[PDB]
Short mmCIF file of C-alpha atoms and ligand atoms in Angstrom, two decimals:
data_model
loop_
_atom_site.label_atom_id
_atom_site.label_comp_id
_atom_site.label_asym_id
_atom_site.label_seq_id
_atom_site.Cartn_x
_atom_site.Cartn_y
_atom_site.Cartn_z
CA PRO A 1 99.10 57.42 65.06
CA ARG A 2 98.78 60.45 67.60
CA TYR A 3 95.75 61.54 66.65
CA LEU A 4 93.26 62.23 70.17
CA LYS A 5 90.08 59.70 69.66
CA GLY A 6 86.55 61.09 68.80
CA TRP A 7 85.54 60.29 72.75
CA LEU A 8 88.56 62.21 74.23
CA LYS A 9 88.45 65.06 71.45
CA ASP A 10 84.66 65.29 73.22
CA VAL A 11 85.85 65.34 76.31
CA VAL A 12 88.15 68.08 76.50
CA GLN A 13 85.34 70.20 74.57
CA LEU A 14 83.35 69.50 77.97
CA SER A 15 85.99 70.04 79.79
CA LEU A 16 86.31 73.43 79.20
CA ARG A 17 82.98 73.86 79.52
CA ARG A 18 82.40 72.39 82.85
CA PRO A 19 80.61 74.32 85.25
CA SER A 20 82.59 74.98 88.38
CA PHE A 21 80.79 73.10 91.86
CA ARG A 22 80.26 75.32 95.07
CA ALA A 23 81.53 73.30 98.02
CA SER A 24 83.54 73.12 101.85
CA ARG A 25 85.68 69.69 102.06
CA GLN A 26 85.29 67.74 104.73
CA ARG A 27 88.46 67.08 106.00
CA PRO A 28 92.01 68.10 105.28
CA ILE A 29 94.24 66.14 102.45
CA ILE A 30 95.58 62.89 103.01
CA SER A 31 98.61 62.04 100.63
CA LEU A 32 98.44 59.67 98.07
CA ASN A 33 101.70 59.30 97.14
CA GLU A 34 102.59 59.47 100.56
CA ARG A 35 100.55 55.96 101.30
CA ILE A 36 101.66 54.59 98.51
CA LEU A 37 105.68 54.51 99.67
CA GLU A 38 104.17 53.58 103.32
CA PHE A 39 102.57 50.84 101.54
CA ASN A 40 106.39 49.96 99.63
CA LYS A 41 107.84 50.29 103.34
CA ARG A 42 105.23 47.77 104.37
CA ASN A 43 105.10 45.47 101.49
CA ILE A 44 101.78 45.14 100.56
CA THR A 45 100.57 45.88 97.33
CA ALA A 46 99.92 49.18 96.59
CA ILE A 47 96.28 49.23 94.40
CA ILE A 48 94.29 52.11 93.71
CA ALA A 49 90.90 50.99 93.18
CA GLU A 50 88.90 52.71 90.55
CA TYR A 51 85.25 53.63 90.49
CA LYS A 52 83.64 54.14 87.10
CA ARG A 53 80.44 53.16 85.76
CA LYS A 54 80.74 53.05 82.18
CA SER A 55 83.58 53.30 80.08
CA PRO A 56 84.21 53.77 76.45
CA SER A 57 85.74 50.70 76.12
CA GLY A 58 82.30 49.07 76.69
CA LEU A 59 82.24 48.77 80.72
CA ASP A 60 78.47 48.78 82.20
CA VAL A 61 78.13 48.30 85.93
CA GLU A 62 75.43 49.75 88.05
CA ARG A 63 77.37 49.28 91.49
CA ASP A 64 76.74 51.62 94.25
CA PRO A 65 79.50 54.32 94.72
CA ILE A 66 79.70 54.02 99.13
CA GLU A 67 79.19 50.61 98.77
CA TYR A 68 82.35 50.12 96.56
CA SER A 69 84.17 52.67 98.57
CA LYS A 70 83.37 51.21 101.95
CA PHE A 71 84.56 47.74 100.83
CA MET A 72 87.92 49.13 99.08
CA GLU A 73 88.43 51.21 101.84
CA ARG A 74 89.62 47.35 103.41
CA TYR A 75 92.01 46.83 100.37
CA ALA A 76 93.32 49.72 98.16
CA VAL A 77 95.99 52.32 98.90
CA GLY A 78 93.25 55.06 97.26
CA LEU A 79 90.55 55.15 95.68
CA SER A 80 90.42 56.74 91.82
CA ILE A 81 87.22 58.31 90.85
CA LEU A 82 85.71 59.18 87.57
CA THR A 83 84.30 62.40 87.14
CA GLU A 84 84.29 62.65 83.45
CA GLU A 85 80.22 62.44 82.66
CA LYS A 86 79.56 61.55 78.71
CA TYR A 87 81.13 58.31 78.72
CA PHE A 88 82.34 57.24 82.45
CA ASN A 89 78.86 58.28 83.82
CA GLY A 90 81.35 59.93 86.80
CA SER A 91 79.66 63.08 88.54
CA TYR A 92 80.87 65.55 91.03
CA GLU A 93 78.33 64.47 93.40
CA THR A 94 79.00 61.21 93.52
CA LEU A 95 83.03 62.29 94.48
CA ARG A 96 81.67 64.68 96.81
CA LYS A 97 79.05 61.61 99.13
CA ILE A 98 82.35 58.95 98.03
CA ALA A 99 84.98 61.56 99.66
CA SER A 100 82.80 62.41 102.89
CA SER A 101 82.74 58.99 103.45
CA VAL A 102 86.11 57.41 103.28
CA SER A 103 89.89 58.37 104.66
CA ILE A 104 92.37 57.26 102.41
CA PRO A 105 93.25 58.94 99.72
CA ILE A 106 90.93 59.65 96.86
CA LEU A 107 92.29 60.39 93.37
CA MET A 108 90.16 63.08 90.90
CA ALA A 109 90.19 61.25 87.44
CA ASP A 110 88.85 63.49 84.86
CA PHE A 111 89.90 65.42 81.30
CA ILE A 112 91.75 68.71 83.81
CA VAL A 113 92.48 71.86 81.42
CA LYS A 114 91.54 74.24 83.31
CA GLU A 115 92.50 76.02 86.38
CA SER A 116 88.49 75.66 88.36
CA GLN A 117 89.07 71.44 87.87
CA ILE A 118 91.62 71.39 90.15
CA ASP A 119 89.39 74.14 92.53
CA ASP A 120 86.46 71.20 92.08
CA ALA A 121 88.78 68.64 93.35
CA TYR A 122 89.61 70.44 96.20
CA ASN A 123 86.23 71.42 96.78
CA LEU A 124 84.48 68.15 96.51
CA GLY A 125 87.32 66.38 99.22
CA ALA A 126 89.79 64.25 96.41
CA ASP A 127 93.62 64.49 97.67
CA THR A 128 94.93 65.12 94.55
CA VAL A 129 93.85 65.10 90.45
CA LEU A 130 95.09 63.30 87.62
CA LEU A 131 96.81 65.08 84.51
CA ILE A 132 97.19 63.68 81.30
CA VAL A 133 100.67 64.64 79.47
CA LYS A 134 98.84 64.21 75.92
CA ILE A 135 96.21 66.83 76.28
CA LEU A 136 98.32 69.70 77.09
CA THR A 137 100.62 72.49 76.40
CA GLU A 138 103.85 71.75 78.22
CA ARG A 139 103.09 75.24 79.37
CA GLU A 140 99.88 74.02 80.82
CA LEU A 141 101.23 71.28 82.61
CA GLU A 142 104.26 72.53 84.04
CA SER A 143 101.34 75.55 85.42
CA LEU A 144 98.75 73.09 86.40
CA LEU A 145 101.36 71.17 88.16
CA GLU A 146 102.34 73.98 89.99
CA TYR A 147 98.39 75.44 90.93
CA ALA A 148 97.76 71.69 92.29
CA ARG A 149 100.72 71.69 94.70
CA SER A 150 99.73 75.08 95.54
CA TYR A 151 96.83 72.99 97.47
CA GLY A 152 98.95 70.43 99.29
CA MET A 153 97.90 67.73 96.27
CA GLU A 154 100.95 66.16 94.58
CA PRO A 155 98.98 64.98 91.05
CA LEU A 156 99.23 61.96 89.20
CA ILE A 157 100.78 63.00 85.59
CA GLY A 158 99.35 60.61 83.57
CA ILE A 159 102.09 59.16 80.44
CA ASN A 160 101.39 57.39 77.72
CA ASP A 161 104.55 57.36 75.61
CA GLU A 162 108.39 58.57 76.07
CA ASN A 163 107.73 61.98 74.95
CA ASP A 164 104.96 62.25 77.45
CA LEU A 165 107.59 61.10 80.08
CA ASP A 166 110.06 63.50 78.59
CA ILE A 167 107.70 66.13 79.18
CA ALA A 168 106.57 64.95 83.13
CA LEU A 169 110.49 64.56 83.72
CA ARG A 170 111.41 68.32 82.19
CA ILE A 171 108.61 69.79 84.87
CA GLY A 172 109.69 68.13 87.48
CA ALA A 173 106.53 65.25 88.08
CA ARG A 174 107.30 63.80 91.62
CA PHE A 175 104.30 60.86 90.60
CA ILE A 176 103.74 59.43 87.55
CA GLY A 177 101.13 57.10 85.73
CA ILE A 178 102.30 55.23 83.56
CA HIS A 179 99.76 54.21 80.81
CA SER A 180 99.62 52.20 77.54
CA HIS A 181 95.18 48.44 76.32
CA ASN A 182 105.33 45.79 74.55
CA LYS A 183 107.34 44.52 76.59
CA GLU A 184 110.61 46.52 76.17
CA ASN A 185 108.77 49.57 75.85
CA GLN A 186 107.42 49.21 79.12
CA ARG A 187 110.50 48.31 80.67
CA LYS A 188 112.39 51.20 78.89
CA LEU A 189 110.02 54.01 80.59
CA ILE A 190 109.87 52.58 83.61
CA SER A 191 113.50 53.15 84.00
CA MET A 192 113.90 56.08 82.93
CA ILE A 193 112.17 57.50 86.15
CA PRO A 194 114.57 58.74 88.84
CA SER A 195 114.04 56.56 92.72
CA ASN A 196 112.61 59.92 94.05
CA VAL A 197 108.90 59.21 91.58
CA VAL A 198 106.25 57.34 92.80
CA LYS A 199 105.22 55.30 89.51
CA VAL A 200 101.89 53.75 88.98
CA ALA A 201 101.30 51.67 86.66
CA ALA A 202 97.70 52.34 85.29
CA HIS A 203 95.67 50.17 83.80
CA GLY A 204 96.84 46.88 81.54
CA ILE A 205 96.86 44.71 84.48
CA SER A 206 94.21 41.54 84.17
CA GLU A 207 96.33 39.16 86.69
CA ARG A 208 98.54 38.95 90.03
CA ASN A 209 101.49 37.93 87.68
CA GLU A 210 101.92 40.45 86.07
CA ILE A 211 101.82 42.86 89.54
CA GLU A 212 104.66 41.16 90.72
CA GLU A 213 106.77 41.23 87.30
CA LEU A 214 105.80 45.09 87.55
CA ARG A 215 106.57 45.24 91.11
CA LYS A 216 110.12 44.12 90.00
CA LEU A 217 110.44 46.47 88.29
CA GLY A 218 110.04 49.02 90.88
CA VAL A 219 107.29 49.92 89.65
CA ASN A 220 105.14 51.35 93.26
CA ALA A 221 101.28 51.29 92.79
CA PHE A 222 98.97 49.89 90.19
CA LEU A 223 95.50 51.92 89.05
CA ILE A 224 93.06 48.55 88.18
CA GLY A 225 88.97 50.06 87.58
CA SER A 226 87.05 47.77 85.11
CA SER A 227 87.67 44.37 86.81
CA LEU A 228 87.70 45.67 90.26
CA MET A 229 84.00 47.30 89.05
CA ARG A 230 82.77 44.23 87.59
CA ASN A 231 83.76 41.85 90.96
CA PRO A 232 85.19 44.34 94.14
CA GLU A 233 86.97 40.75 95.44
CA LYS A 234 89.17 40.44 92.63
CA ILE A 235 91.62 42.82 94.91
CA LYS A 236 92.25 40.05 97.22
CA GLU A 237 93.98 37.78 94.25
CA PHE A 238 95.94 40.91 93.46
CA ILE A 239 97.30 41.96 97.38
CA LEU A 240 98.16 38.25 97.74
ZN1 ZN B 301 93.51 53.52 80.43
#
């Protein structure tokens, strides 16, 4: 069962050829992992709200990106903007328009395989990027992690199982996203992460009660997309 899905293998081909985007960012980096730590200090639930108009699982929402982002700036600890084009209907231009208008931290969520895609994130105004362990070698992951740090971005390193976590911990990731969409496995992964690493439960969250349960295990933030795209007001239920 360790095959990459058809759509992800196709995305990696699109990412390798992704043209770089010529631009200047309009404000400095605002740290997403530090703001998560500030929310935790204040005891307020930290949700990274994702913007995506489509997904390989069949999400299909037309929602204006500025209006979603304005509303989410009221509630969310940060935004995650999908910039993968074929399956999520994201775009660099949509990231640039959102990052020119909100002043909470922005994660560029895409499938990064080369340095120019981190240069594109910085030039478009994102504050950090997603790196996914399973599509990279360990040497590439360590190099891309250092490349993101060289701009002042602590990247979100996305892991799906214990082997991926083993790699993320070996290379000294400080910001890890735990994705699954089994209870003892999830508890075990969480429990392997050191106190100094900000941990994000990515996807597989539908109700407030799972957020509460994850918080007791020390999860620091929650990356949630589809449900918020279909009703942005759902984030009020989640932060209660
Ligand atoms: Zn997912």
